[PDB]
From a paper:
Furthermore, the structure of the homologous hNCS-1 bound to 3b is solved by X-ray diffraction to understand at the atomic level the basis of its ability to modulate the protein-protein interaction. The asymmetric unit (AU) contained two hNCS-1 molecules with an RMSD for all atoms of 1.28 Å. The feature-enhanced and the 2Fo − Fc electron density maps, together with different map calculations allowed the unambiguous modelling of 3b bound to the hydrophobic crevice of one of the two independent hNCS-1 molecules of the AU, while the second hNCS-1 molecule only showed a PEG molecule at the 3b equivalent position. The indole group of 3b is stabilized with π-π interactions with W30 and F85, weak water-mediated H-bonds with D37, and hydrophobic interactions with L89 and I51. In addition, the 2-hydroxy-3-nitrophenyl ring perpendicular to the surface interacted with V68 and Y52 and F72, W103 and T92. Interestingly, the electron density map showed that the NCS-1 bound 3b molecule only displays the E geometry, the QM-predicted and most stable isomer. When comparing the 3b-free and bound hNCS-1 structures found in the asymmetric unit, a rearrangement takes place to allow ligand recognition: helix H3 shifts and D37 carboxyl reorients to establish weak H-bonds between a group of water molecules and 3b indole group. Furthermore, T92 side chain, that shows double conformations in the absence of 3b, fixes its conformation in the presence of 3b through a H-bond with a water molecule, which permit to establish hydrophobic contacts with the 2-hydroxy-3-nitrophenyl ring. Moreover, 3b does not form strong H-bonds with T92 and Y52 or contact the helix H10, as inhibitors do. Therefore, our data suggest that 3b stabilizes the NCS-1/Ric8a complex keeping the helix H10 out of the crevice, and promoting the entrance and recognition of Ric8a.
The Neuronal Calcium Sensor 1 (NCS-1) is a high-affinity Ca2+-binding protein predominantly expressed in neurons. NCS-1 is a highly conserved protein that regulates synaptogenesis, synaptic transmission and is critical for learning and memory. The interaction between NCS-1 and Ric8a regulates synapse number and probability of neurotransmitter release, thus constituting a pharmacological target for synaptopathies. NCS-1 contains a C-terminal dynamic helix (called H10) that works as a built-in competitive inhibitor and inserts into the crevice to prevent Ric8a binding.
Residue numbers in the entry: 3 to 189
């Protein structure tokens, strides 16, 4: 096995917690192990993954935000159970499940609201990750302008924070958000 096989009860458990079949779970564990022999992905390794996908801007900050959502137990490592569950929601979830995950990504302090400064932190990290290989349209060319449009559309009581309900409904109102979150294996 060389631990490239999971225990049977662990295969059954992870298949039951994800949109993957038993075979798919086993294939992902095999790749996870070749790429991370210790069975634990650290923040540095996560940033390397994002560094290859996005070699034009600095993805340090954004990969760290994502790393922290993958890291459901906050021990500073991604283990396979965490990895596979995060991949299942982000690649195969329903729109409501992806929106719940997205909310956890933006709710940096886990208090149930996304403030404007929280969203600005995430959106700045995204802008930095893409980097200015291309010029954006003027009305969305800073992270501030993007956050202001989002709060205009979604902050219904205009208190400077988004509840989970405001983010979900606000997200569903915008066709480009709906589109981005309704993919299954990217399609
Ligand atoms: O290791 C991975 C996944 C993954 C895909 N293909 C692989 C091959 C080898 C190892 C890992 C992978 N990080 N992406 C994570 C992720 C997190 C959040 C979002 N979001 O922000 O939407 C997303 O789209 C993907
Ligand atoms: Ca962990
Ligand atoms: Ca918060
Ligand atoms: Ca609000
Ligand atoms: Na499954």
């Amino acid at each position: 096995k060389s631990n490239s096989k999971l225990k049977p009860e662990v295969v059954e458990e992870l298949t039951r917690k994800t949109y993957f079949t038993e075979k798919e779970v086993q294939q992902w564990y095999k790749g996870f192990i070749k790429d991370c022999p210790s069975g634990q992905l650290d923040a540095a390794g996560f940033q390397k993954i994002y560094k290859q996908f996005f070699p034009f801007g600095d993805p340090t900050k954004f990969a760290t935000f994502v790393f922290n959502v993958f890291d459901e137990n906050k021990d500073g490592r991604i283990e396979f159970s965490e990895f596979i569950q995060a991949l299942s929601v982000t690649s195969r979830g329903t729109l409501d499940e992806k929106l719940r995950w997205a909310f956890k990504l933006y709710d940096l302090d886990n208090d149930g609201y996304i403030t404007r400064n929280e969203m600005l932190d995430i959106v700045d990290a995204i802008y930095q990750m893409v980097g200015n290989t291309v010029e954006l349209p003027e009305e969305e060319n800073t992270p501030e302008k993007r956050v202001d449009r989002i709060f205009a559309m979604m902050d219904k009581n205009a208190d400077g924070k988004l509840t989970l309900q405001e983010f979900q409904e606000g997200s569903k109102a915008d066709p480009s958000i709906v589109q981005a979150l309704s993919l299954y294996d990217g399609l």
